[PDB]
Ligand binder design. Sequence first.
Ligand SMILES: [K+]
Length: 262
Amino acid sequence: GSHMRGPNPTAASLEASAGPFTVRSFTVSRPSGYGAGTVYYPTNAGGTVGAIAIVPGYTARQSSIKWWGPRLASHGFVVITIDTNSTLDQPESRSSQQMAALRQVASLNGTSSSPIYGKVDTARMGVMGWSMGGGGSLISAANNPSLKAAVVQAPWHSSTNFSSVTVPTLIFACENDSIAPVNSSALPIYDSMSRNAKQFLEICGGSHSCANTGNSDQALIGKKGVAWMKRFMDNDTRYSTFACENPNSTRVCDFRTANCSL
Ligand SMILES: [K+]
């Protein structure tokens, strides 16, 4: 049940600005159930790839999370970054819109006129987001346990109880976050989940935008997000060490993981 694409990974290949595949993109002409979207895709991955939908936080737009689009697609994923219907949408709405974005990618995979026709294995999907978009991602995972992975950054929701989530979930937290503090948001969310592979990585000195486009720890954060998606989306056990390991970085001020098998 594995779906191995690309050269055997190395830390350097995961830390680079791109993986092995060329990336192209298009703007969704008629977004279905969300505000706007950009689809990033590998031109020649060598097989079908999973799809990932990424949602920003409150007041934010695609730019805040856009770096993940080419970063992940270049390793073998179709990635849709969205703007929400309103910048002021809350986590439940963000979840619905994230799942609408996945749905539309899945549909376009079956549409002959799309550049991503036949590129996607629609049985392998994942969710990502920042802050309220991260809370949205975890609501998506709670509601749709067939999702293969979640990677969220500085997550926030009005409740921290994600005890029903069984999807492999990586949380990036930001040490000095004053919007969604680690001790009242990211860490309670992490600690609520007992039935899944999970991981928590706290960036030293980070503000609430520490994982966003323009961040200075992208080599490490990108490596970890790509590795997590490769391991769990693709069931690619070549990525087990990279997905499960403590980074051993002066950039990281706390690291926790559970149920990630080597
Ligand atoms: K439907």
